Amino acid sequence: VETFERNKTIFFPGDPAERVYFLLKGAVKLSRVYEAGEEITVALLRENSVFGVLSLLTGNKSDRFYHAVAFTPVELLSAPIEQVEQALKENPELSMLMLRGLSSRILQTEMMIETLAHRDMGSRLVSFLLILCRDFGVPCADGITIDLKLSHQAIAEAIGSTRVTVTRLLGDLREKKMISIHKKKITVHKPVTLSR
DNA sequence: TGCAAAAAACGCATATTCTCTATGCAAAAAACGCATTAATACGAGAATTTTGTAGCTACTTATACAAAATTCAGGAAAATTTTTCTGTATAATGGGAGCTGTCACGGATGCA
Numbered sequence A: 001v002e003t004f005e006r007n008k009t010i011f012f013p014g015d016p017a018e019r020v021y022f023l024l025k026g027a028v029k030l031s032r033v034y035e036a037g038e039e040i041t042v043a044l045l046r047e048n049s050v051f052g053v054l055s056l057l058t059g060n061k062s063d064r065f066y067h068a069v070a071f072t073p074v075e076l077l078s079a080p081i082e083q084v085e086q087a088l089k090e091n092p093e094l095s096m097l098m099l100r101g102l103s104s105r106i107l108q109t110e111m112m113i114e115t116l117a118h119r120d121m122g123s124r125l126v127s128f129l130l131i132l133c134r135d136f137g138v139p140c141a142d143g144i145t146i147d148l149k150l151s152h153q154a155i156a157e158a159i160g161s162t163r164v165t166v167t168r169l170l171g172d173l174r175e176k177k178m179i180s181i182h183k184k185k186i187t188v189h190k191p192v193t194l195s196r
Numbered sequence B: 001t002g003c004a005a006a007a008a009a010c011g012c013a014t015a016t017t018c019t020c021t022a023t024g025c026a027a028a029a030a031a032c033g034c035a036t037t038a039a040t041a042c043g044a045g046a047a048t049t050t051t052g053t054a055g056c057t058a059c060t061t062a063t064a065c066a067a068a069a070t071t072c073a074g075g076a077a078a079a080t081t082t083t084t085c086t087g088t089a090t091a092a093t094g095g096g097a098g099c100t101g102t103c104a105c106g107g108a109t110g111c112a
Helices: A081-090 A095-116 A122-130 A165-175 A191-195
Strands: A027-030 A043-046
Touching: A043 A095, A081 A095, A095 A122, A122 A165, A122 A191
Parallel strands: none
Antiparallel strands: A027 A043
């Protein structure tokens, strides 16, 4: 079942990602692209949604122009336009799910979309951490734990910080012990805290 | 089977007369004018007022030292398999396997 780790290349320029990526699990992201570039988690998929997104544009040869990779050993299918094909033509069985797919990944980002559009990025970080680091693990070191080990330059890549939102922002959070270098727990003791 | 010929029909004498072509009536449409009212637009007033421009200020980042806390490449033991070397003590005493049906040529020797 289609199952992808980090440090990869999943979409490309031009992809045929039509026949389903069919993402089932990750805790992770659609990096996108286009020309100016920014292959950013310009969407996401954790466990519980599914691709089939620009794969369902003009379809198997649209102008499919993204590129994504994980940090999770993503989980995602072993079939072609069949399980979807049911889902597409023969009914709304997983047709509503097809629509849901967009409303479960595009619209998922849509929320982060009206929120990533803020001045300081710390907000986007706190939001992101409010949903993920908190929930699907236990708020360990100093509170709503980073729910994994990543990097302090994570922000430096997530949003593309320039060794600036790093040590400075970290500094602030080091001052309010809402951080934990150890196993990258880095976090407020309480979810509401930085969520204000 | 030639007509001469008669009576009734079928053709030159008008009543009838009745579709017929022909003007004045009349009734209600219509449209034109008296026109009235109201509404569509001009005049003034000062009110909001957004945009356009300056300086201050907060965020954001350009950059210069380097061993962060972690990755990796050899170095040198084992660990087990495998490899090479050395050794095991009655008697044992000359080796099989086809060539024998090709025609013709060119030296090269042996053999009296």
